[PDB]
Design a binder for these strands. Structure first.
Ligand code: MG
Ligand code: ZN
Ligand code: ZN
Ligand code: ZN
Lengths: 269, 97, 88, 171, 559, 187, 112, 107
RNA sequence: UUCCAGGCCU
DNA sequence: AGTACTTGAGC
DNA sequence: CTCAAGTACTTAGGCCGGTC
C-alpha cells in the first residue's frame, strides 16, 4: 500500500520532490536536499552545556589579559592584543555563535544535541590532525581573520539549490542553516586553535573537504525516494515482533486515517 | 522464475531504469504491433511484406506506427476493447504540462 | 504549447556535477555503443572490454555525449560530459 | 505548380557510424531516402536544396540498442499535380484508348473520350497516331493538357486529363 | 521482437486516451461479420466456418492465412470482428452511470433538469473536474423530478422566464437486475394517477433519451463529444475479440479446445439469433422481452460475472465461466500479475549456503547454471578471439557458449548445427556465451521489500548445486541456510549490466539510507571469533601469525 | 524504423479524420499547400510557387552548389555554361551523373522536361518576370501558371488559369501577357 | 499541526521497536498524506483516487472498475507514471531514465 | 468579522455574500477562547501578495494545482482570513535543515 | 493448459 | 472478515 | 431533512496432487 502510494515520488533536477502530476510533495527532499546515505550522528555543542562553559570555550577577547589568546596557541597572538578591529570580527563570531545557541535551543526544545547531519566533521579533522602531524606544542599560524573569515566563505559554498534568485537563494539558506551551526560550532576561533592547534594549511584543507564532502552528500536528482521511503518504513514493519494501541496494528490504524482510534488518550500539560 | 511486483518496486527504488524494462520486455513479453496514427488502436493491417498498412474503417494506410510493448498489455488492450473500452495509443502528446 | 524549447546553457540551474545515474547511464550507453563496434576516442591500452573503454573514455571526458536534463514542467538544460564534473 | 516545401525526416543511425563523417553520412542518407521519393502528401520529391546547410540537430541515442535518431530538418523542390491544373508536356505512349502525355516526372493520360471526337485515331500508324482536319498526334507531338483528376500511387502520382476544352490540345 | 522488420516508423506511447466504442467504429474496425455461433469446422470438415472464430480474424493452426495479413500466429495479433446485436443492451459496468445519468436528465427532451437558471447548479456547473462535477451535478437534480419550462428569472422572482419545454414529471429510478424502473405520480386522490405508476425502462427507450441529451450537456455532466458520449454506454454493436484473446487450446488433432470466452460469445450469439427471429417472425410480442433479457444477460455476464443478482451463469459443470473483468482483476490479473510482475527468461534459483571464502560481492554459481544461463555478446575484434574459442569450445565444456546469431536474424544452435565445429564469427554477430567468472548479476531473496534485497554480485562459477554467497550480505537479504533458496537473474545488454554494476553492487548498498547507517557487517563465527581474537589475554606466537599475515590478500608482506 | 517525411505543420488529428478537402485549381490545394504555410524557421511564410525554368534554375543551382561540397571533402571544374537549349540537355545530364542519386529517374526526367519546356532560360530574365508577376496580389499558383504557361488572350489566360477571372481585369492581364511574350527569352 | 501529530504518532510506531528510520522517509509519506488538503488515507479510498493517470491507479484495487470509469469520462494518461511505462514496456522516467542522451556532432569531431 | 455567542440564524447567514466586494467573516466565541496559532505544533503562516505568489510560481515552474493545499475551512485559514487562491508560507523548524520553507494554496 | 486441494519457506 | 463509503427511511 | 442499515472490496508472495 505504501509503495503503490509513493511509487512516482522522485527528486527532480530542481531539487523539488514530485509525482506524475509534477505536483510538489517536498520542496527540498528531506527538507535539506541530502541523500540519507551520507549522514552521521554529529554533535551540536553550541546547544547544551552551561551558559558559563560556553564562554570558556567560544569567547575570545583580545581587549583583555585573561580572555585573549595566549600567543602560545596563535603566532600573531601578542601583537593582536587590544586590536579593536579584530575584536569586531572576533565579536561578530561570538555574537553569531550565540544566536545559534538560542536557535538550536528553539528547534530542539528538548535540549538534545546528537543528530543526523551531513559531512562528519570530527573525523574530517581527526585526520586533519595526523595528516599534518600537527604538534599541539608549537603555535599555529592563522589570523583571527584567516579563521573567522574563511569559515564565512566555507558556507558561501555548501550549495544545495543553485537557482539565481531570491526565492531560490532564500531557500538555500533555509535548507542549510542547521549544518552551518554545526560548522561554527566546530570551526570557532578558540576551538580551532586551542582545541586542536590547526595550522594554516591543515585548516585550509579541512575547509575544502567539508565543502566537497558536503556537495557529495547532496541528493541526486534521480532518486526514486517514494518507493524508497515506503520500503524503508514498511521494511522495519515486518521486523516488528509485537496500555496504548502499539506498533503493527496501530500503524495500520494510522495509514487508514483511523476514523476512531482504539486507544485515544489526550495528554494535557 | 517470476520477477513479480516486489522485485519491480525494488528496482525502481534502485534507479535501475533500463534493466527493469529489459527484464519486463526482452526477458519476457516484449512484442510488436502497429497503430493507426489516429484511432489509437491496434487495428492496423500490417502486411509487412508489401507494406500495405490500411487499418481501414479509419482508413489510413499512410500514417502508421510500430511500437514495442508487452504482449501482455497488447492483450490487456484487446481485452479492454472486448468490453467496449477504447485504450487509444498516441505516439506524441498535446497535454504538455 | 511551448515550442520555446528550453533553457540556454546560460542560466542553467541544475547541479554542476553528474548524477550517479547519468554516469551509470552514460558509461553503459557509450559501452553499448563501443560494443556495437562504434568509434573509440581513447587509446585503448588493451582494455578489450567495452564498459572499460567506456570508463576510460569517461576519464578523458572524450565521450561525445550530451545529457538532456528535464525539468518538472518540460523545459530542459543541456550538459556535455565535459561540462559535468565527476565526484560521483 | 512546382513548390518548395520545408520538411523534416527522422533518420536512425547505427552507433557504428558514430564517427566524424557523421553529418556526412547522415546527409547522404537523407538524400537516399528522399530525392526521387513520392507521396500523396507532398507528391514527387525532386531535389533537396542547400546541401551545405542541412540542419541535423543533436540526435538522441535510442534506449535498448545504441542507435541515434536525428530529425534532419531540410527543404526541397517538389511537384504535386492537382485537378484542373493546366500542364503541357510531351506525349509518351499512345493506344486505341488514348495517348499518355508526360509532364514532369509524372504521366497524365488522355482517353479517346476526353478529346474532340473529330480527332480520329490512326491504326496502321508508324508510330501510332490520332488525326484531325489539321492535327496529328504521336510520339513527341507536344501537348497542353488539363489535369482532370489524380490517383496518388505507390510512388507515382498518376492522373487523367482532357484536351477537349478550348485553348487546349496541340501547341 | 515480434520479428520480421517493418518500415513502420516506431515510437513510444506518450499519451493513453480512454474512450468508448461507437457501434459504427466497432463496425468499421471489424473484419468479421460474425453470424454463426458454432465454432467453425466446415460442418465436420476441419477448418473454420465463416461464422465465428476466424471468419477472417486471426487464425489457428500454424497458417500464414489470416485474411492476407499472413504472418503466421506470432506477429498477426488479433483482428476484431463484430456482431450487430438484436436489441440495445446495457453495459454491465456503466449500468450505475446509465442510471445516475438518467436520474440527471429528462425523457422526451433530454435536457438538464438544472440550467444555469438554478444557482446551486452553476456552483457545480463550474467545478472543473469531469467527475467531482458529475458528482455535484447529479446530487443536485437527482431530486427535481419535473423538466420545467419556467423558473424565476435573473430578475424579480415575480417575473418568471422559460427555457426548455416538456414538464413531464420524472420517475424515481431504481435498480433491479439488469434493467431499470421508475414510478411517476400526478396527484393522489385528486385527479387520476394517485399512487406511483410503475414502468420499466427499455434500453431503446433509454438509449434514445441519452442520444437526444445536448452536446454541451454531454460534457456539462462528465462525458465527451468524441470519445465517450453517454449514448454509447449502451451497446448496439458488439466487438469480437479475435482468437488470441480466446485461444482454442486444441488437444492434438480432431480434438476440442475452445476458450471459456469463445463459449460465452457463442452463447451470446445464439441468445441473439433467437431474439431476432422472435421478432422478424411470429412475435408473441411481450413473450420476446422474456427472451431478450437473456441477451442482456449473456452480453452482461460476458464482461462481468461476479455480480449482485447472483446467478453466476455456470459453464455447465459448475464452473462459473471467467468474465473478462475477472481476467484483469487484481493480483494474477492481466495487470497486477502480468504487467507489474512477469515470469522471466535468464533467471535461476537454488538453495543458498553461506561461504566465508568469498568476497562480500561475489556469488558462487553452480557450473550447472553457469552453462544454462547465457549472455548475448556481440562479436568484436576485441573478443573475436576469445569468442570463437568459446563457440567452437562447445556448449558443454564450462567456458563456452550455446548459440551464435549472424546478422540474418537466424540462430545457429551450437549443440546441433552440423557446422558447429566450423563457424567463423563475424564482428557484428552475437554469441550467447556462458555466464562467466565476474559477469554482473542481480541476486535477490524475496520477499523483496528492501532496496538491498536485490544486489548485483560478481559471478564466480563454482561446483556443487548451491548459490554460495558471502556471509555479511546475509542480513540484507534476510537470508538463512535452513533450506532457503534465492533467485538470480542475468542482465542481457552492455548498458543493463552497467546499470547493475554501477548502482546495484553490494559494495554500494553497503550503507543504507533507511537508517543512515550500514546494513551489512560482521556476524557469527567472525564476530564471535573477532572478540576472542582481540582480548588482552590473547596472544599468538610466530608460525601462526605468519600464516595469518599471509591470509590477508593485500598485506604489505612485511611482518 | 524509417520515418516518412513529416511536414512543418502539426494539426492535432483527433480521431475525426473526416474532412480532407478536394484538391482543385479552385485554389483549393491541400492543407500541405496553404498560402499560410510555416517556414521551418518557425516564422510564417507564403506558399512557394515556381514556374517552369524558374524551377529549372533552382534545381540546377543547388544541384551544382552541391557538386562543390562534393569536392570540398574529396580533398579532406564546373563553373556554369550559357543557354544552348539542346546542348544543355547534355550538360545537365552530366551534372546529374555526379550529384544526383542516379536511379533518381524522376529528377532527370524532370530536368529534360523543365529544360525543354522552360520559358526563360536565363537568371536576370527570370527575376524580371517575377518582379512583374509577383505584384498582382495573385496567388502563387497563378503567379506560377501565368509564368510557365504561354498565353495570348485574357481568354486563353483566364481559361487555363480559371481561378483568375474576377481577380485581374482583362486588359491589365492582357498587358502583362504581352510583357511576357516579350521577355520570353528567345531560343 | 496535523502533519505534525501524524508524523509524531507514526514515529512512535517505529520507535516502539527501537528501530530507527530517517525522518525524511516518514516525513515524505506523512507529507504525501497531508499535502493534498487534509488527511488523505493510504488506501483504495484515499490516495489511489487522485488525478493520477488511470493506468497507474488501475494497478491497485479499483483495477477493472477504475478503467471503466476512464473510458466513460474519456481520461488521458501522461504516462508520466512509473507504472504507466512498466505496463507499456517502456523505460520509465526514473533515475537512469530521468533524462535523454545525445551525440553532439561537435564534440564528436574535436575528438580525433 | 463577527463574534457570535451561541449561533446564528440559518436564514441570516444566507446574507454574507450580500455585499460584495466587502465580504463578511463569522466566528464563534467559545472558539476564540484560546488562540490555536499559539499551539506548540502549528507554525507561522503568511499571506502573499498576488506578486509574492505569481513570483512563487514563476520561480518553481508551478501550476496552481501542483501546489500543496490548505483547506478553506482550515483552522488557521480563517485566522489569517484566507481566501480561495491566496498562498501561504508555512515556515517551520526542522530536525534536518533547521528551518523549512513550505507553501500552501487555498482550496 | 484449466479447475479445486494440500503442502513448504527455524 | 472488517470495514469503509453509500443508500435507504422515518420524520 | 438528518439517522441507521445497505452495499461493496481486498485479504502478501515466492515454489512444489485429484480431474475441468
Ligand atoms: Mg529458512
Ligand atoms: Zn484507424
Ligand atoms: Zn492477420
Ligand atoms: Zn423534458
Amino acid at each position: 500500500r505504501l509503495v503503490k502510494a509513493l511509487e512516482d515520488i522522485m527528486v527532480h533536477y530542481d531539487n523539488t520532490t514530485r509525482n506524475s502530476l509534477g505536483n510538489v510533495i517536498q520542496f527540498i527532499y528531506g527538507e535539506d536536499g541530502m541523500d540519507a546515505a551520507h549522514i552521521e550522528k554529529q554533535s551540536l555543542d553550541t546547544i547544551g552545556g552551561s551558559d558559563a562553559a560556553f564562554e570558556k570555550r567560544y569567547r575570545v577577547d583580545l581587549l583583555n589579559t585573561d580572555h585573549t589568546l595566549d600567543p602560545s596557541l596563535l603566532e600573531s597572538g601578542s601583537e593582536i592584543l587590544g586590536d579593536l578591529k579584530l575584536q569586531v570580527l572576533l565579536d561578530e563570531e561570538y555574537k553569531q555563535l550565540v544566536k545559534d545557541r538560542k536557535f538550536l535551543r528553539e528547534v530542539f526544545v528538548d535540549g538534545e544535541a546528537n543528530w543526523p547531519l551531513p559531512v562528519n566533521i570530527r573525523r574530517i579533522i581527526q585526520n586533519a590532525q595526523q595528516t599534518f602531524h600537527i604538534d599541539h606544542t608549537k603555535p599555529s599560524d592563522l589570523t583571527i581573520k584567516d579563521i573567522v573569515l574563511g569559515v564565512k566563505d566555507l558556507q558561501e559554498n555548501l550549495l544545495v539549490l543553485r537557482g539565481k534568485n531570491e526565492i531560490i537563494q532564500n531557500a538555500q539558506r533555509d535548507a542549510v542553516t542547521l549544518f552551518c551551526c554545526l560548522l561554527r560550532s566546530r570551526l570557532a576561533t578558540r576551538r580551532v586553535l586551542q582545541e586542536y592547534r590547526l595550522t594554516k594549511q591543515a585548516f585550509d584543507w579541512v575547509l575544502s573537504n567539508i565543502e566537497a564532502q558536503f556537495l557529495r552528500s547532496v541528493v541526486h536528482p534521480g532518486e526514486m525516494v517514494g518507493v524508497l521511503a515506503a520500503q524503508s518504513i514498511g521494511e522495519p514493519a515486518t521486523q516488528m515482533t509485537l496500555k496504548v494501541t502499539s506498533g503493527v496494528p496501530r500503524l495500520k490504524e494510522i495509514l487508514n486515517v483511523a476514523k476512531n482510534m482504539k486507544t485515544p488518550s489526550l495528554t494535557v500539560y | 522464475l517470476r520477477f513479480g511486483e516486489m522485485e519491480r518496486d525494488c528496482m525502481i527504488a534502485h534507479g535501475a531504469a533500463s534493466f527493469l524494462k529489459e527484464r519486463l520486455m526482452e526477458a519476457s513479453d516484449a512484442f510488436r504491433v502497429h497503430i493507426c496514427g489516429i484511432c489509437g488502436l491496434m487495428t492496423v493491417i500490417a502486411k509487412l511484406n508489401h507494406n500495405q498498412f490500411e487499418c481501414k474503417g479509419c482508413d489510413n494506410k499512410i500514417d502508421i506506427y510500430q511500437i514495442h510493448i508487452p504482449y501482455a498489455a497488447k492483450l490487456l488492450f484487446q481485452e479492454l476493447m472486448a468490453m467496449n473500452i477504447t485504450p487509444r495509443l498516441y505516439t506524441d502528446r498535446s497535454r504538455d504540462f | 504549447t511551448l515550442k520555446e524549447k528550453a533553457i540556454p546553457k546560460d542560466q542553467r540551474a541544475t547541479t554542476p556535477y553528474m548524477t550517479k545515474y547519468e554516469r551509470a547511464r552514460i558509461l553503459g550507453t557509450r559501452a553499448l555503443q563501443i560494443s556495437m563496434n562504434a568509434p573509440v576516442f581513447v587509446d585503448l591500452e588493451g582494455e578489450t572490454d567495452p564498459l572499460r573503454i567506456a570508463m576510460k573514455e569517461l576519464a578523458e571526458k572524450k565521450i561525445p555525449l550530451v545529457i538532456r536534463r528535464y525539468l518538472p514542467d518540460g523545459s530542459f538544460e543541456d550538459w556535455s560530459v565535459e561540462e559535468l564534473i565527476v565526484d560521483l | 505548380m512546382f513548390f518548395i516545401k520545408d520538411l523534416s525526416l527522422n533518420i536512425t543511425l547505427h552507433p557504428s557510424f558514430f564517427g566524424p563523417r557523421m553529418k556526412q553520412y547522415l546527409k547522404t542518407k537523407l538524400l537516399e531516402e528522399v530525392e526521387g521519393s513520392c507521396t500523396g502528401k507532398f507528391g514527387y520529391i525532386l531535389c533537396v536544396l542547400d546541401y551545405d546547410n542541412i540542419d541535423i540537430q543533436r540526435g538522441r541515442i535510442l534506449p535498448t540498442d545504441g542507435s541515434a535518431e536525428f530529425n534532419v530538418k531540410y527543404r526541397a523542390v517538389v511537384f504535386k499535380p492537382f485537378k484542373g491544373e493546366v500542364v503541357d508536356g510531351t506525349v509518351v505512349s499512345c493506344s486505341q484508348h488514348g495517348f499518355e502525355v508526360q509532364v514532369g516526372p509524372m504521366k497524365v493520360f488522355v482517353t479517346k473520350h476526353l478529346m474532340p471526337q473529330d480527332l480520329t485515331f490512326n491504326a496502321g500508324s508508324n508510330p501510332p497516331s490520332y488525326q484531325s482536319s489539321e492535327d496529328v498526334i504521336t510520339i513527341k507531338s507536344r501537348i497542353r493538357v488539363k489535369i482532370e483528376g489524380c490517383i496518388s500511387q505507390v510512388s507515382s502520382i498518376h492522373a487523367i486529363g482532357s484536351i477537349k476544352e478550348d485553348y487546349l490540345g496541340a501547341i | 521482437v515480434g520479428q520480421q522488420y517493418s518500415s513502420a516508423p516506431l515510437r513510444t506511447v506518450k499519451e493513453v486516451q480512454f474512450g468508448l466504442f461507437s457501434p459504427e467504429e466497432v463496425r468499421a474496425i471489424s473484419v468479421a461479420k460474425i453470424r454463426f455461433p458454432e465454432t467453425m469446422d466446415e460442418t465436420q470438415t476441419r477448418a473454420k466456418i465463416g461464422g465465428l472464430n476466424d471468419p477472417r480474424l486471426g487464425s489457428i493452426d500454424r497458417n500464414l492465412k489470416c485474411q492476407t495479413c499472413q504472418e503466421g500466429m506470432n506477429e498477426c495479433p488479433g483482428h476484431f470482428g463484430h456482431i450487430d446485436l438484436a436489441k440495445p443492451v446495457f453495459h454491465v459496468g456503466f449500468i450505475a452511470k446509465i442510471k445516475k445519468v438518467c436520474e440527471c436528465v429528462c425523457m422526451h427532451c433530454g435536457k438538464l433538469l438544472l440550467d444555469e437558471h438554478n444557482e446551486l447548479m452553476r456552483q457545480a456547473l463550474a467545478i472543473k473536474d469531469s467527475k467531482k462535477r458529475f458528482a455535484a451535478i447529479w446530487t443536485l437534480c437527482k431530486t427535481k423530478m419535473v423538466c420545467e419550462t419556467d423558473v424565476p428569472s435573473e430578475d424579480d422572482p415575480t417575473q418568471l422566464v422559460s427555457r426548455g419545454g416538456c414538464g413531464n414529471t420524472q420517475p424515481t429510478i431504481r435498480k433491479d437486475g439488469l434493467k431499470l424502473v421508475g414510478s411517476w405520480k400526478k396527484d393522489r386522490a385528486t385527479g387520476d394517477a394517485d399512487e406511483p405508476e410503475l414502468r420499466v425502462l427499455s434500453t431503446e427507450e433509454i438509449l434514445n433519451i441519452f442520444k437526444h441529451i445536448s452536446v454541451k450537456d454531454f460534457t456539462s455532466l462528465g462525458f465527451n463529444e468524441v470519445f465517450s458520449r453517454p449514448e454509447w454506454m449502451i451497446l448496439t454493436c458488439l466487438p469480437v475479440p479475435p482468437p488470441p484473446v480466446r485461444p482454442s487450446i486444441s488437444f492434438n488433432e480432431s480434438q476440442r479446445g475452445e476458450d471459456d470466452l469463445t463459449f460465452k460469445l457463442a452463447d451470446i450469439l445464439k441468445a441473439n439469433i433467437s431474439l431476432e427471429t422472435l421478432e422478424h417472425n411470429g412475435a408473441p410480442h411481450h413473450a420476446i422481452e422474456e427472451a431478450e433479457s437473456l441477451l442482456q444477460f449473456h452480453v452482461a455476464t460476458y464482461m462481468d460475472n461476479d455480480i449482485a443478482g447472483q446467478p453466476q451463469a455456470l459453464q455447465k459443470s459448475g464452473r462459473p465461466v471467467k468474465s473478462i473483468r475477472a481476467r484483469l482483476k487484481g493480483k494474477e490479473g492481466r495487470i497486477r500479475g502480468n504487467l507489474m510482475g512477469k515470469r522471466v527468461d535468464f533467471s535461476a534459483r537454488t538453495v543458498i549456503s553461506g561461504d566465508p571464502n568469498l568476497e562480500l560481492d561475489q556469488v558462487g554459481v553452480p557450473k550447472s547454471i553457469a552453462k544454462t544461463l547465457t549472455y548475448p555478446e556481440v562479436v568484436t575484434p576485441y573478443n573475436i578471439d576469445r569468442l570463437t574459442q568459446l563457440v567452437r569450445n562447445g556448449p558443454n565444456e564450462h567456458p563456452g557458449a550455446k548459440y551464435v546469431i549472424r546478422d540474418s536474424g537466424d540462430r545457429i544452435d551450437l549443440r546441433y548445427s552440423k557446422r558447429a565445429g566450423d563457424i567463423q564469427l563475424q564482428y557484428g554477430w552475437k554469441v550467447e556465451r556462458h555466464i562467466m567468472d565476474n559477469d554482473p548479476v542481480l541476486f535477490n531473496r524475496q520477499p523483496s521489500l528492501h532496496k538491498m534485497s536485490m544486489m548485483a554480485h560478481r559471478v564466480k562459477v563454482i561446483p556443487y548445486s548451491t548459490f554460495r554467497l558471502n556471509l555479511s550480505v546475509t542480513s540484507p537479504y534476510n537470508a538463512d541456510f535452513d533450506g532457503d533458496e534465492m533467485n538470480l537473474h542475468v542482465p542481457q545488454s552492455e548498458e543493463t549490466r552497467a546499470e547493475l554494476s554501477q548502482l546495484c553492487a553490494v559494495p554500494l548498498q553497503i550503507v543504507s539510507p533507511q537508517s543512515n547507517k550500514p546494513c551489512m557487517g560482521i556476524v557469527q563465527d567472525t564476530l564471535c571469533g573477532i572478540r576472542k581474537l582481540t582480548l588482552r589475554d590473547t596472544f599468538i606466537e610466530l608460525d601462526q601469525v605468519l600464516n595469518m599475515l599471509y591470509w590477508v590478500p593485500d598485506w604489505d608482506g612485511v611482518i | 524504423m524509417n520515418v516518412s517525411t513529416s511536414t512543418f505543420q502539426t494539426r492535432r488529428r483527433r480521431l475525426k479524420k473526416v474532412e480532407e478537402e478536394e484538391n482543385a485549381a479552385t485554389l483549393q490545394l491541400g492543407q500541405e499547400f496553404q498560402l499560410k504555410q510555416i517556414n521551418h524557421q518557425g516564422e510564417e511564410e507564403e506558399l512557394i510557387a515556381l514556374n517552369l525554368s524558374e524551377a529549372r534554375l533552382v534545381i540546377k543551382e543547388a544541384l551544382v552548389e552541391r557538386r562543390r561540397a562534393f569536392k570540398r571533402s574529396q580533398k579532406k571544374d564546373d563553373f556554369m555554361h550559357s543557354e544552348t537549349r539542346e546542348k544543355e540537355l547534355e550538360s545537365i545530364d552530366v551534372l546529374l551523373e555526379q550529384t544526383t542519386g542516379g536511379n533518381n529517374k524522376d529528377l532527370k526526367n524532370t530536368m529534360q522536361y523543365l529544360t525543354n519546356f522552360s520559358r526563360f532560360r536565363d537568371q536576370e530574365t527570370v527575376g524580371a518576370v517575377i518582379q512583374l508577376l509577383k505584384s498582382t496580389g495573385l496567388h502563387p499558383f497563378e503567379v506560377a501558371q501565368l509564368g510557365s504557361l504561354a498565353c495570348d488572350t485574357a481568354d486563353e489566360a483566364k481559361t487555363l488559369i480559371p481561378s483568375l477571372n474576377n481577380k485581374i481585369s482583362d486588359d491589365e492581364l492582357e498587358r502583362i501577357l504581352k510583357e511576357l511574350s516579350n521577355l520570353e527569352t528567345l531560343y | 499541526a496535523g502533519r505534525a501529530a501524524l508524523y509524531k504518532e507514526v514515529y512512535n510506531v517505529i520507535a516502539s521497536d527501537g528501530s530507527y528510520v530517517n525522518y525524511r522517509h516518514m516525513a515524505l509519506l506523512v507529507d504525501v498524506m497531508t499535502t493534498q488538503g487534509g488527511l488523505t488515507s493510504v488506501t483504495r479510498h484515499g490516495f489511489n483516487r487522485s488525478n493520477t493517470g488511470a493506468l497507474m491507479r488501475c494497478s491497485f484495487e479499483e483495477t477493472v472498475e477504475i478503467l471503466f470509469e476512464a473510458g466513460a469520462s474519456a481520461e488521458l494518461d501522461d504516462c508520466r507514471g512509473v507504472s504507466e511505462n512498466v505496463i507499456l514496456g517502456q523505460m520509465a522516467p526514473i533515475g537512469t531514465g530521468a533524462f535523454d542522451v545525445m551525440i553532439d556532432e561537435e564534440s564528436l569531431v574535436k575528438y580525433m | 468579522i463577527f463574534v457570535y455567542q451561541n449561533n446564528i440564524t440559518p436564514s441570516a447567514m444566507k446574507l454574507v455574500p450580500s455585499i460584495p466586494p466587502a465580504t463578511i467573516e463569522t466566528f464563534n466565541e467559545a472558539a476564540l477562547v484560546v488562540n490555536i496559532t499559539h499551539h506548540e505544533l502549528v507554525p507561522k503562516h503568511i499571506r502573499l501578495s498576488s506578486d509574492e505568489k505569481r513570483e512563487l510560481l514563476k520561480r518553481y515552474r508551478l501550476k496552481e494545482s501542483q501546489l500543496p493545499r490548505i483547506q478553506r475551512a482550515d483552522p488557521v485559514a480563517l485566522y489569517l482570513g484566507l481566501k480561495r487562491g491566496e498562498v501561504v508560507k508555512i515556515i517551520r523548524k526542522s530536525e534536518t535543515s533547521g528551518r523549512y520553507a513550505s507553501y500552501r494554496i487555498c482550496m
